[PDB]
Amino acid sequence: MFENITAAPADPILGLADLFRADERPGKINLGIGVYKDETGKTPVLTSVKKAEQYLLENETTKNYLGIDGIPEFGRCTQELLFGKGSALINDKRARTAQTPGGTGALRVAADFLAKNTSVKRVWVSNASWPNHKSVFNSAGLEVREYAYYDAENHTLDFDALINSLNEAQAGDVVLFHGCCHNATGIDPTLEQWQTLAQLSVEKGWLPLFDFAYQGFARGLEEDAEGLRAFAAMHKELIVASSYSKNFGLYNERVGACTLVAADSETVDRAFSQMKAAIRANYSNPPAHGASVVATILSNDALRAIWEQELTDMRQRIQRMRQLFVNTLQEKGANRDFSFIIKQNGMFSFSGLTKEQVLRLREEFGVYAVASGRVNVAGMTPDNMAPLCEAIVAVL
Amino acid sequence: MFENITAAPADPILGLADLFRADERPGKINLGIGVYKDETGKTPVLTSVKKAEQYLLENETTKNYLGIDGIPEFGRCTQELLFGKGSALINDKRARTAQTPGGTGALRVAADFLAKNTSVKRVWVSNASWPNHKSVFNSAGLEVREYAYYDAENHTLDFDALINSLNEAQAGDVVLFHGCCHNATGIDPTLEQWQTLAQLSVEKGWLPLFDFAYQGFARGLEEDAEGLRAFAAMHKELIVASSYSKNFGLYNERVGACTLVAADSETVDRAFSQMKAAIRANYSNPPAHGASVVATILSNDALRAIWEQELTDMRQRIQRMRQLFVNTLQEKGANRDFSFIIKQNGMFSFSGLTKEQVLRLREEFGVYAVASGRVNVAGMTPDNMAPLCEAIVAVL
């Protein structure tokens, strides 16, 4: 039965990792990472998390199954975070949240749900985006199309090409938007651009699906939710796939949520029922640990205060690195202008390096980056900044 | 887009639970539960587990993503448990294991894998089986057929009717077997019967898929594996979906595994890669907590000893309850012969009660069971035995 099965291709990252590892060089630098890293180059457990885990250890009296949608408080806390407290969506009971196995899990669940309970056949994803979006939707039997977003020339958001490409999309088609910290350009729309897309979306009959994996990494918790909040105020229906992997550093515990928004309570409840059915047929019910931690932190004034501070430190670490990277480049005698790096949010950005420059960087300098020139700024340290910039300069 | 979505039907167990709760009655008894419960009516966290969690709290330094297949030690430990150490399958490197979000998750993964990488179209499941099996497979777009297994007249395994229905199954079709503690008859084949099915399976060109969720609940760890072990010795290819939810009391942490067996190492590796691709398109990578706990216990001589004893205590509670149940009925003036209850393994059994008898028990006595007459013996206690039996007698 498995004799003729052909090997799946790779996932460059894991491939890059192994190569990195098996490298005897000393000054090696891995910028191909997909997680946050501190000044020492590690991905530590948050202090607030560790505290929450101690609390669970001492209070948990059972590991009995959670409901299909998971922990209730996790759901309400998640909603407040997304829509802000006092939101009508909330007071109107128009949103239902399901705890899922990470952000990817949320995406998959939304996909299976749409594929069996609606007429959706196509999902539009931005270009230069997170490659895993394609596989998730395709796996549910959905068509995936690409809209223009990034401008590899000017390193910016080509709003015209965007609006223009999105005109080829039909009513009932889904359009996927990154809430903030676009992966992997780091280029987000302005509040005014968000409001324009929202207006246009309603006019065209699109079903917006938000991929929100970096809340708090661009400007702050509330700020980062402006775009989504702009859409929510204008739409009857909406879908949000959120992740807590990065902002809580809970990567391996698979913590995320899928939020369904309908015109009214009666409708969201009827629609949510089919979402649960989709879940029951996948993994049955969600993993409690990670989600319990989140609910414990978000609901504790003390712990929450500590966590917000840890998140701020992460955000600022990143902003510092972007700035420090551009300066060290200019100093080291950088041929080109890299100031655009400072206008981009989150951990990722396209360096603008050619495929051949990337290859050279690694072969000759032990500097690791994805062939697309994408780099993870959290892989930079005040310590490695100099050797990094000198290498790059050498390949320009 | 969600205006005309029809509400998903119910899941009686969850419907039963809600009804159970809303019951102001005093002597209520819920035999409709799907989990193990102790003499006090609770589902506690195992001592070995709490110890392992302590250990992780103190030793964990990161929550960085696990590989797609999860923790390596979790895998090797799972394989030893399944095939026994020193197994040729292991030494021959013919099996690859993937950590999944519970047993259900493992099933779903196998399904997606089969659906996209092979010519499988049908999956044969036994009758009087676990209903969720249908939904999982259908979700992947697989056909689900039923084979004869349980004999509701004699309360037994009708080997003949079984061998007979399975004849209509063609080569290349998958047949699903419950490793031990058949859900929900509690009727398992004998070693000799397993061996007969194994010989037949090879001859017919079937692809065996084992659902192993109650290892250690029938006779013991190694005993409960005879069947699967009998098949493994005869097949080139095989798939196993195991769960640790019950035997480790880790319900909500979603801990299970999906093991793939091929003819040789090159083949299983090539096939496993497509299995990883299926995972990546689903939830990305697995939840660490639960699985970490399992690997810690299983690899630590002291903890493992403690866990084995805890598992034994659970198994023994059940066998005791079955015995006590039959006896108390008999002395309560029991009409029918329930002695078959003593020959069934695990938490589940069909009491042989009628849909109307079930409805009456609850309406009149507060005793709760599934309309199918399925009862969970772990729901019984030396304390509630008498009343439970008097109620049953009153409806015979």
mmCIF file with all atom_site columns, C-alpha atoms in Angstrom, chain A residues 1-9 11 14 34-35 37 43-45 49-50 53-54 56-68 101-102 104-106 108 112-114 116-120 130 132 135-136 139 171-174 205-207 237-239 243 245-246 249-254 260-262 267 270-271 273-274 277-290, chain B residues 1-9 11 14 34-35 37 43-45 49-50 53-54 56-66 68 101-102 104-106 108-109 112-114 116-120 130 132 135-136 139 171-174 205-207 237-239 243 245-246 249-254 260-262 267 270-271 273-274 277-290:
data_model
loop_
_atom_site.group_PDB
_atom_site.id
_atom_site.type_symbol
_atom_site.label_atom_id
_atom_site.label_alt_id
_atom_site.label_comp_id
_atom_site.label_asym_id
_atom_site.label_entity_id
_atom_site.label_seq_id
_atom_site.pdbx_PDB_ins_code
_atom_site.Cartn_x
_atom_site.Cartn_y
_atom_site.Cartn_z
_atom_site.occupancy
_atom_site.B_iso_or_equiv
_atom_site.pdbx_formal_charge
_atom_site.auth_seq_id
_atom_site.auth_comp_id
_atom_site.auth_asym_id
_atom_site.auth_atom_id
_atom_site.pdbx_PDB_model_num
ATOM 1   C CA . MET A 1 1   ? 0.000   0.000  0.000  1.00 0.00 ? 1   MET A CA 1
ATOM 2   C CA . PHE A 1 2   ? 2.928   2.365  0.664  1.00 0.00 ? 2   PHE A CA 1
ATOM 3   C CA . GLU A 1 3   ? 5.277   1.072  -2.013 1.00 0.00 ? 3   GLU A CA 1
ATOM 4   C CA . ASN A 1 4   ? 4.672   3.876  -4.495 1.00 0.00 ? 4   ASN A CA 1
ATOM 5   C CA . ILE A 1 5   ? 4.339   6.741  -2.060 1.00 0.00 ? 5   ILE A CA 1
ATOM 6   C CA . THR A 1 6   ? 6.542   9.679  -3.093 1.00 0.00 ? 6   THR A CA 1
ATOM 7   C CA . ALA A 1 7   ? 8.435   11.633 -0.491 1.00 0.00 ? 7   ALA A CA 1
ATOM 8   C CA . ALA A 1 8   ? 7.043   14.945 0.561  1.00 0.00 ? 8   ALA A CA 1
ATOM 9   C CA . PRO A 1 9   ? 9.253   17.863 -0.304 1.00 0.00 ? 9   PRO A CA 1
ATOM 10  C CA . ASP A 1 11  ? 10.045  22.948 4.464  1.00 0.00 ? 11  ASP A CA 1
ATOM 11  C CA . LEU A 1 14  ? 13.742  22.703 9.096  1.00 0.00 ? 14  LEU A CA 1
ATOM 12  C CA . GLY A 1 34  ? 10.868  31.294 13.356 1.00 0.00 ? 34  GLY A CA 1
ATOM 13  C CA . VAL A 1 35  ? 10.718  32.126 17.036 1.00 0.00 ? 35  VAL A CA 1
ATOM 14  C CA . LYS A 1 37  ? 15.080  34.914 20.882 1.00 0.00 ? 37  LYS A CA 1
ATOM 15  C CA . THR A 1 43  ? 13.763  31.169 23.908 1.00 0.00 ? 43  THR A CA 1
ATOM 16  C CA . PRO A 1 44  ? 12.981  31.212 27.601 1.00 0.00 ? 44  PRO A CA 1
ATOM 17  C CA . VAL A 1 45  ? 9.827   30.449 29.440 1.00 0.00 ? 45  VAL A CA 1
ATOM 18  C CA . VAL A 1 49  ? 3.981   31.531 32.619 1.00 0.00 ? 49  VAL A CA 1
ATOM 19  C CA . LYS A 1 50  ? 6.204   29.704 35.104 1.00 0.00 ? 50  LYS A CA 1
ATOM 20  C CA . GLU A 1 53  ? 2.235   26.685 35.882 1.00 0.00 ? 53  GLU A CA 1
ATOM 21  C CA . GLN A 1 54  ? 3.062   26.498 39.577 1.00 0.00 ? 54  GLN A CA 1
ATOM 22  C CA . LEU A 1 56  ? -1.942  24.861 38.143 1.00 0.00 ? 56  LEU A CA 1
ATOM 23  C CA . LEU A 1 57  ? 0.325   22.236 39.635 1.00 0.00 ? 57  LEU A CA 1
ATOM 24  C CA . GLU A 1 58  ? -0.984  23.042 43.116 1.00 0.00 ? 58  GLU A CA 1
ATOM 25  C CA . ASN A 1 59  ? -4.666  23.464 42.242 1.00 0.00 ? 59  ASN A CA 1
ATOM 26  C CA . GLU A 1 60  ? -5.539  21.095 39.395 1.00 0.00 ? 60  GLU A CA 1
ATOM 27  C CA . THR A 1 61  ? -7.677  18.256 40.751 1.00 0.00 ? 61  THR A CA 1
ATOM 28  C CA . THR A 1 62  ? -8.531  16.575 37.467 1.00 0.00 ? 62  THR A CA 1
ATOM 29  C CA . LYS A 1 63  ? -7.497  16.242 33.825 1.00 0.00 ? 63  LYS A CA 1
ATOM 30  C CA . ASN A 1 64  ? -11.004 15.441 32.695 1.00 0.00 ? 64  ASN A CA 1
ATOM 31  C CA . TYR A 1 65  ? -11.929 16.399 29.139 1.00 0.00 ? 65  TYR A CA 1
ATOM 32  C CA . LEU A 1 66  ? -12.656 20.026 28.357 1.00 0.00 ? 66  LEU A CA 1
ATOM 33  C CA . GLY A 1 67  ? -15.695 20.977 26.303 1.00 0.00 ? 67  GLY A CA 1
ATOM 34  C CA . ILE A 1 68  ? -15.212 20.876 22.536 1.00 0.00 ? 68  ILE A CA 1
ATOM 35  C CA . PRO A 1 101 ? -4.335  23.640 18.947 1.00 0.00 ? 101 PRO A CA 1
ATOM 36  C CA . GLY A 1 102 ? -2.378  26.808 18.114 1.00 0.00 ? 102 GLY A CA 1
ATOM 37  C CA . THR A 1 104 ? -2.494  26.843 12.589 1.00 0.00 ? 104 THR A CA 1
ATOM 38  C CA . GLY A 1 105 ? -5.111  24.685 14.260 1.00 0.00 ? 105 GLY A CA 1
ATOM 39  C CA . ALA A 1 106 ? -7.546  27.597 14.244 1.00 0.00 ? 106 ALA A CA 1
ATOM 40  C CA . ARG A 1 108 ? -7.546  24.438 9.761  1.00 0.00 ? 108 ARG A CA 1
ATOM 41  C CA . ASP A 1 112 ? -12.995 22.583 7.357  1.00 0.00 ? 112 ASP A CA 1
ATOM 42  C CA . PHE A 1 113 ? -15.994 24.533 8.626  1.00 0.00 ? 113 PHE A CA 1
ATOM 43  C CA . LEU A 1 114 ? -16.238 26.805 5.586  1.00 0.00 ? 114 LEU A CA 1
ATOM 44  C CA . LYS A 1 116 ? -18.592 21.877 4.524  1.00 0.00 ? 116 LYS A CA 1
ATOM 45  C CA . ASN A 1 117 ? -21.049 24.469 5.757  1.00 0.00 ? 117 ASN A CA 1
ATOM 46  C CA . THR A 1 118 ? -20.805 27.249 3.171  1.00 0.00 ? 118 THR A CA 1
ATOM 47  C CA . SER A 1 119 ? -20.417 27.945 -0.514 1.00 0.00 ? 119 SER A CA 1
ATOM 48  C CA . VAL A 1 120 ? -16.833 29.162 -0.143 1.00 0.00 ? 120 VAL A CA 1
ATOM 49  C CA . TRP A 1 130 ? 3.357   32.644 5.223  1.00 0.00 ? 130 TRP A CA 1
ATOM 50  C CA . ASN A 1 132 ? 1.677   27.364 5.288  1.00 0.00 ? 132 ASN A CA 1
ATOM 51  C CA . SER A 1 135 ? -1.444  23.887 2.478  1.00 0.00 ? 135 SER A CA 1
ATOM 52  C CA . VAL A 1 136 ? -3.967  24.415 5.229  1.00 0.00 ? 136 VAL A CA 1
ATOM 53  C CA . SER A 1 139 ? -6.080  20.444 2.510  1.00 0.00 ? 139 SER A CA 1
ATOM 54  C CA . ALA A 1 171 ? -18.753 37.876 -3.471 1.00 0.00 ? 171 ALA A CA 1
ATOM 55  C CA . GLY A 1 172 ? -18.660 34.945 -1.082 1.00 0.00 ? 172 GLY A CA 1
ATOM 56  C CA . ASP A 1 173 ? -14.874 34.569 -1.524 1.00 0.00 ? 173 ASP A CA 1
ATOM 57  C CA . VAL A 1 174 ? -12.694 34.721 1.563  1.00 0.00 ? 174 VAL A CA 1
ATOM 58  C CA . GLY A 1 205 ? -19.365 40.740 -0.317 1.00 0.00 ? 205 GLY A CA 1
ATOM 59  C CA . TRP A 1 206 ? -16.090 39.282 0.942  1.00 0.00 ? 206 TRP A CA 1
ATOM 60  C CA . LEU A 1 207 ? -15.725 37.118 4.003  1.00 0.00 ? 207 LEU A CA 1
ATOM 61  C CA . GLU A 1 237 ? -19.792 38.103 9.671  1.00 0.00 ? 237 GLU A CA 1
ATOM 62  C CA . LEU A 1 238 ? -16.115 37.618 10.380 1.00 0.00 ? 238 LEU A CA 1
ATOM 63  C CA . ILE A 1 239 ? -13.570 34.904 11.297 1.00 0.00 ? 239 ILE A CA 1
ATOM 64  C CA . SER A 1 243 ? -2.335  32.479 18.310 1.00 0.00 ? 243 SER A CA 1
ATOM 65  C CA . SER A 1 245 ? 2.494   31.111 20.722 1.00 0.00 ? 245 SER A CA 1
ATOM 66  C CA . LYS A 1 246 ? 4.618   34.234 20.323 1.00 0.00 ? 246 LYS A CA 1
ATOM 67  C CA . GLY A 1 249 ? 6.113   32.247 24.433 1.00 0.00 ? 249 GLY A CA 1
ATOM 68  C CA . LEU A 1 250 ? 3.917   29.124 24.595 1.00 0.00 ? 250 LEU A CA 1
ATOM 69  C CA . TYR A 1 251 ? 4.981   27.781 21.185 1.00 0.00 ? 251 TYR A CA 1
ATOM 70  C CA . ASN A 1 252 ? 4.963   24.020 21.973 1.00 0.00 ? 252 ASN A CA 1
ATOM 71  C CA . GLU A 1 253 ? 1.787   23.981 24.072 1.00 0.00 ? 253 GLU A CA 1
ATOM 72  C CA . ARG A 1 254 ? -0.379  24.801 21.017 1.00 0.00 ? 254 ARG A CA 1
ATOM 73  C CA . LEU A 1 260 ? -16.700 33.195 14.737 1.00 0.00 ? 260 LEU A CA 1
ATOM 74  C CA . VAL A 1 261 ? -18.683 36.380 14.285 1.00 0.00 ? 261 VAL A CA 1
ATOM 75  C CA . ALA A 1 262 ? -22.278 36.442 12.977 1.00 0.00 ? 262 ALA A CA 1
ATOM 76  C CA . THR A 1 267 ? -27.066 32.727 13.983 1.00 0.00 ? 267 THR A CA 1
ATOM 77  C CA . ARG A 1 270 ? -26.287 27.749 15.013 1.00 0.00 ? 270 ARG A CA 1
ATOM 78  C CA . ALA A 1 271 ? -23.123 28.281 12.980 1.00 0.00 ? 271 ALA A CA 1
ATOM 79  C CA . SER A 1 273 ? -22.514 24.183 16.393 1.00 0.00 ? 273 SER A CA 1
ATOM 80  C CA . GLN A 1 274 ? -21.163 23.112 13.017 1.00 0.00 ? 274 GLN A CA 1
ATOM 81  C CA . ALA A 1 277 ? -18.747 19.292 14.784 1.00 0.00 ? 277 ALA A CA 1
ATOM 82  C CA . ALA A 1 278 ? -15.692 20.035 12.651 1.00 0.00 ? 278 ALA A CA 1
ATOM 83  C CA . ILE A 1 279 ? -13.539 19.955 15.783 1.00 0.00 ? 279 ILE A CA 1
ATOM 84  C CA . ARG A 1 280 ? -15.024 16.725 17.076 1.00 0.00 ? 280 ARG A CA 1
ATOM 85  C CA . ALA A 1 281 ? -14.015 15.093 13.793 1.00 0.00 ? 281 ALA A CA 1
ATOM 86  C CA . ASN A 1 282 ? -10.443 16.383 14.027 1.00 0.00 ? 282 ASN A CA 1
ATOM 87  C CA . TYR A 1 283 ? -8.858  16.213 17.488 1.00 0.00 ? 283 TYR A CA 1
ATOM 88  C CA . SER A 1 284 ? -12.080 15.995 19.567 1.00 0.00 ? 284 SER A CA 1
ATOM 89  C CA . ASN A 1 285 ? -11.282 18.614 22.249 1.00 0.00 ? 285 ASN A CA 1
ATOM 90  C CA . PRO A 1 286 ? -8.290  20.952 22.919 1.00 0.00 ? 286 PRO A CA 1
ATOM 91  C CA . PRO A 1 287 ? -5.102  20.659 25.082 1.00 0.00 ? 287 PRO A CA 1
ATOM 92  C CA . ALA A 1 288 ? -5.698  22.278 28.480 1.00 0.00 ? 288 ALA A CA 1
ATOM 93  C CA . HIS A 1 289 ? -2.204  23.171 29.813 1.00 0.00 ? 289 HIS A CA 1
ATOM 94  C CA . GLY A 1 290 ? -1.219  26.047 27.515 1.00 0.00 ? 290 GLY A CA 1
ATOM 95  C CA . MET B 1 1   ? -22.784 33.673 4.573  1.00 0.00 ? 1   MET B CA 1
ATOM 96  C CA . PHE B 1 2   ? -23.954 31.854 7.753  1.00 0.00 ? 2   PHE B CA 1
ATOM 97  C CA . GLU B 1 3   ? -27.680 32.641 7.427  1.00 0.00 ? 3   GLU B CA 1
ATOM 98  C CA . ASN B 1 4   ? -28.788 29.221 6.188  1.00 0.00 ? 4   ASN B CA 1
ATOM 99  C CA . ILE B 1 5   ? -26.432 26.996 8.168  1.00 0.00 ? 5   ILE B CA 1
ATOM 100 C CA . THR B 1 6   ? -28.338 24.121 9.789  1.00 0.00 ? 6   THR B CA 1
ATOM 101 C CA . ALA B 1 7   ? -27.578 23.294 13.371 1.00 0.00 ? 7   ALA B CA 1
ATOM 102 C CA . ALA B 1 8   ? -25.430 20.246 13.893 1.00 0.00 ? 8   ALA B CA 1
ATOM 103 C CA . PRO B 1 9   ? -27.322 17.446 15.588 1.00 0.00 ? 9   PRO B CA 1
ATOM 104 C CA . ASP B 1 11  ? -24.108 14.181 20.919 1.00 0.00 ? 11  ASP B CA 1
ATOM 105 C CA . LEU B 1 14  ? -23.109 15.740 26.108 1.00 0.00 ? 14  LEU B CA 1
ATOM 106 C CA . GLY B 1 34  ? -16.973 8.337  29.093 1.00 0.00 ? 34  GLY B CA 1
ATOM 107 C CA . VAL B 1 35  ? -14.175 8.501  31.646 1.00 0.00 ? 35  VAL B CA 1
ATOM 108 C CA . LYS B 1 37  ? -13.998 7.456  37.982 1.00 0.00 ? 37  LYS B CA 1
ATOM 109 C CA . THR B 1 43  ? -11.393 11.598 38.052 1.00 0.00 ? 43  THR B CA 1
ATOM 110 C CA . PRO B 1 44  ? -8.153  12.454 39.769 1.00 0.00 ? 44  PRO B CA 1
ATOM 111 C CA . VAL B 1 45  ? -4.738  13.337 38.568 1.00 0.00 ? 45  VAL B CA 1
ATOM 112 C CA . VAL B 1 49  ? 1.618   12.436 36.775 1.00 0.00 ? 49  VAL B CA 1
ATOM 113 C CA . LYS B 1 50  ? 1.743   15.110 39.456 1.00 0.00 ? 50  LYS B CA 1
ATOM 114 C CA . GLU B 1 53  ? 4.619   17.755 36.260 1.00 0.00 ? 53  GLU B CA 1
ATOM 115 C CA . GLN B 1 54  ? 6.695   18.912 39.208 1.00 0.00 ? 54  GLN B CA 1
ATOM 116 C CA . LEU B 1 56  ? 8.898   19.637 34.244 1.00 0.00 ? 56  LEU B CA 1
ATOM 117 C CA . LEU B 1 57  ? 8.108   22.825 36.104 1.00 0.00 ? 57  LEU B CA 1
ATOM 118 C CA . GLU B 1 58  ? 11.584  22.732 37.631 1.00 0.00 ? 58  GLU B CA 1
ATOM 119 C CA . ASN B 1 59  ? 13.485  21.592 34.587 1.00 0.00 ? 59  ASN B CA 1
ATOM 120 C CA . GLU B 1 60  ? 11.804  23.184 31.570 1.00 0.00 ? 60  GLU B CA 1
ATOM 121 C CA . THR B 1 61  ? 13.878  26.009 30.046 1.00 0.00 ? 61  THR B CA 1
ATOM 122 C CA . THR B 1 62  ? 11.950  26.657 26.830 1.00 0.00 ? 62  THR B CA 1
ATOM 123 C CA . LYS B 1 63  ? 8.630   26.107 25.131 1.00 0.00 ? 63  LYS B CA 1
ATOM 124 C CA . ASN B 1 64  ? 10.099  26.141 21.661 1.00 0.00 ? 64  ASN B CA 1
ATOM 125 C CA . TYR B 1 65  ? 8.242   24.144 19.010 1.00 0.00 ? 65  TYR B CA 1
ATOM 126 C CA . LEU B 1 66  ? 8.599   20.395 18.984 1.00 0.00 ? 66  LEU B CA 1
ATOM 127 C CA . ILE B 1 68  ? 6.396   17.744 13.587 1.00 0.00 ? 68  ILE B CA 1
ATOM 128 C CA . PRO B 1 101 ? -3.373  15.454 19.918 1.00 0.00 ? 101 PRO B CA 1
ATOM 129 C CA . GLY B 1 102 ? -4.905  12.345 21.500 1.00 0.00 ? 102 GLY B CA 1
ATOM 130 C CA . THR B 1 104 ? -8.841  10.919 17.931 1.00 0.00 ? 104 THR B CA 1
ATOM 131 C CA . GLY B 1 105 ? -6.124  13.160 16.513 1.00 0.00 ? 105 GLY B CA 1
ATOM 132 C CA . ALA B 1 106 ? -4.118  10.071 15.542 1.00 0.00 ? 106 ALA B CA 1
ATOM 133 C CA . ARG B 1 108 ? -7.756  11.895 11.897 1.00 0.00 ? 108 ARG B CA 1
ATOM 134 C CA . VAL B 1 109 ? -4.125  12.048 10.827 1.00 0.00 ? 109 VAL B CA 1
ATOM 135 C CA . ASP B 1 112 ? -5.867  12.426 5.927  1.00 0.00 ? 112 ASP B CA 1
ATOM 136 C CA . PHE B 1 113 ? -2.709  10.488 5.146  1.00 0.00 ? 113 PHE B CA 1
ATOM 137 C CA . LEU B 1 114 ? -4.563  7.571  3.608  1.00 0.00 ? 114 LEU B CA 1
ATOM 138 C CA . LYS B 1 116 ? -4.193  11.768 -0.049 1.00 0.00 ? 116 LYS B CA 1
ATOM 139 C CA . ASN B 1 117 ? -1.404  9.247  -0.397 1.00 0.00 ? 117 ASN B CA 1
ATOM 140 C CA . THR B 1 118 ? -3.040  5.948  -1.177 1.00 0.00 ? 118 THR B CA 1
ATOM 141 C CA . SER B 1 119 ? -5.881  4.396  -3.109 1.00 0.00 ? 119 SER B CA 1
ATOM 142 C CA . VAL B 1 120 ? -7.876  3.625  0.034  1.00 0.00 ? 120 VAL B CA 1
ATOM 143 C CA . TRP B 1 130 ? -17.466 4.029  18.876 1.00 0.00 ? 130 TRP B CA 1
ATOM 144 C CA . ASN B 1 132 ? -16.917 9.001  16.353 1.00 0.00 ? 132 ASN B CA 1
ATOM 145 C CA . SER B 1 135 ? -17.216 11.217 11.456 1.00 0.00 ? 135 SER B CA 1
ATOM 146 C CA . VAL B 1 136 ? -13.452 11.126 11.518 1.00 0.00 ? 136 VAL B CA 1
ATOM 147 C CA . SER B 1 139 ? -14.260 14.019 7.245  1.00 0.00 ? 139 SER B CA 1
ATOM 148 C CA . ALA B 1 171 ? -8.082  -5.871 -1.090 1.00 0.00 ? 171 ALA B CA 1
ATOM 149 C CA . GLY B 1 172 ? -6.781  -2.376 -0.438 1.00 0.00 ? 172 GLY B CA 1
ATOM 150 C CA . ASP B 1 173 ? -9.635  -1.643 1.985  1.00 0.00 ? 173 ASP B CA 1
ATOM 151 C CA . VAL B 1 174 ? -8.863  -0.725 5.569  1.00 0.00 ? 174 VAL B CA 1
ATOM 152 C CA . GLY B 1 205 ? -4.952  -7.795 1.190  1.00 0.00 ? 205 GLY B CA 1
ATOM 153 C CA . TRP B 1 206 ? -6.512  -5.644 3.950  1.00 0.00 ? 206 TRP B CA 1
ATOM 154 C CA . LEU B 1 207 ? -4.776  -2.770 5.665  1.00 0.00 ? 207 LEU B CA 1
ATOM 155 C CA . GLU B 1 237 ? 2.151   -2.594 6.555  1.00 0.00 ? 237 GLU B CA 1
ATOM 156 C CA . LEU B 1 238 ? 0.050   -1.555 9.461  1.00 0.00 ? 238 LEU B CA 1
ATOM 157 C CA . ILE B 1 239 ? -1.232  1.550  11.272 1.00 0.00 ? 239 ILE B CA 1
ATOM 158 C CA . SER B 1 243 ? -4.174  7.057  23.204 1.00 0.00 ? 243 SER B CA 1
ATOM 159 C CA . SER B 1 245 ? -5.982  9.596  27.873 1.00 0.00 ? 245 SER B CA 1
ATOM 160 C CA . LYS B 1 246 ? -7.346  6.716  29.906 1.00 0.00 ? 246 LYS B CA 1
ATOM 161 C CA . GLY B 1 249 ? -5.676  9.824  33.196 1.00 0.00 ? 249 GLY B CA 1
ATOM 162 C CA . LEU B 1 250 ? -4.412  12.597 30.835 1.00 0.00 ? 250 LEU B CA 1
ATOM 163 C CA . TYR B 1 251 ? -7.775  13.199 29.115 1.00 0.00 ? 251 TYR B CA 1
ATOM 164 C CA . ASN B 1 252 ? -7.551  16.948 28.541 1.00 0.00 ? 252 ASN B CA 1
ATOM 165 C CA . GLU B 1 253 ? -3.848  17.137 27.648 1.00 0.00 ? 253 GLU B CA 1
ATOM 166 C CA . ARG B 1 254 ? -4.502  15.338 24.333 1.00 0.00 ? 254 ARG B CA 1
ATOM 167 C CA . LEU B 1 260 ? 3.066   3.709  10.738 1.00 0.00 ? 260 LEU B CA 1
ATOM 168 C CA . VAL B 1 261 ? 4.534   0.343  9.797  1.00 0.00 ? 261 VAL B CA 1
ATOM 169 C CA . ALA B 1 262 ? 6.049   -0.421 6.405  1.00 0.00 ? 262 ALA B CA 1
ATOM 170 C CA . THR B 1 267 ? 9.664   2.762  2.699  1.00 0.00 ? 267 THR B CA 1
ATOM 171 C CA . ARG B 1 270 ? 9.314   7.966  2.654  1.00 0.00 ? 270 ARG B CA 1
ATOM 172 C CA . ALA B 1 271 ? 5.716   7.307  3.732  1.00 0.00 ? 271 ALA B CA 1
ATOM 173 C CA . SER B 1 273 ? 7.190   12.242 5.389  1.00 0.00 ? 273 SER B CA 1
ATOM 174 C CA . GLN B 1 274 ? 3.767   12.450 3.760  1.00 0.00 ? 274 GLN B CA 1
ATOM 175 C CA . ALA B 1 277 ? 2.997   16.903 5.647  1.00 0.00 ? 277 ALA B CA 1
ATOM 176 C CA . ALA B 1 278 ? -0.580  16.004 6.675  1.00 0.00 ? 278 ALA B CA 1
ATOM 177 C CA . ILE B 1 279 ? 0.156   17.086 10.241 1.00 0.00 ? 279 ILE B CA 1
ATOM 178 C CA . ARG B 1 280 ? 1.745   20.336 9.160  1.00 0.00 ? 280 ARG B CA 1
ATOM 179 C CA . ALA B 1 281 ? -1.447  21.181 7.274  1.00 0.00 ? 281 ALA B CA 1
ATOM 180 C CA . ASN B 1 282 ? -3.528  20.410 10.348 1.00 0.00 ? 282 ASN B CA 1
ATOM 181 C CA . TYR B 1 283 ? -2.196  21.621 13.736 1.00 0.00 ? 283 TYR B CA 1
ATOM 182 C CA . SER B 1 284 ? 1.499   22.078 12.745 1.00 0.00 ? 284 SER B CA 1
ATOM 183 C CA . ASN B 1 285 ? 3.171   20.292 15.669 1.00 0.00 ? 285 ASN B CA 1
ATOM 184 C CA . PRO B 1 286 ? 1.905   18.632 18.868 1.00 0.00 ? 286 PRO B CA 1
ATOM 185 C CA . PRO B 1 287 ? 1.237   19.863 22.438 1.00 0.00 ? 287 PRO B CA 1
ATOM 186 C CA . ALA B 1 288 ? 4.226   19.087 24.657 1.00 0.00 ? 288 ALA B CA 1
ATOM 187 C CA . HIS B 1 289 ? 2.874   19.044 28.239 1.00 0.00 ? 289 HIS B CA 1
ATOM 188 C CA . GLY B 1 290 ? 0.895   15.756 28.252 1.00 0.00 ? 290 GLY B CA 1
#
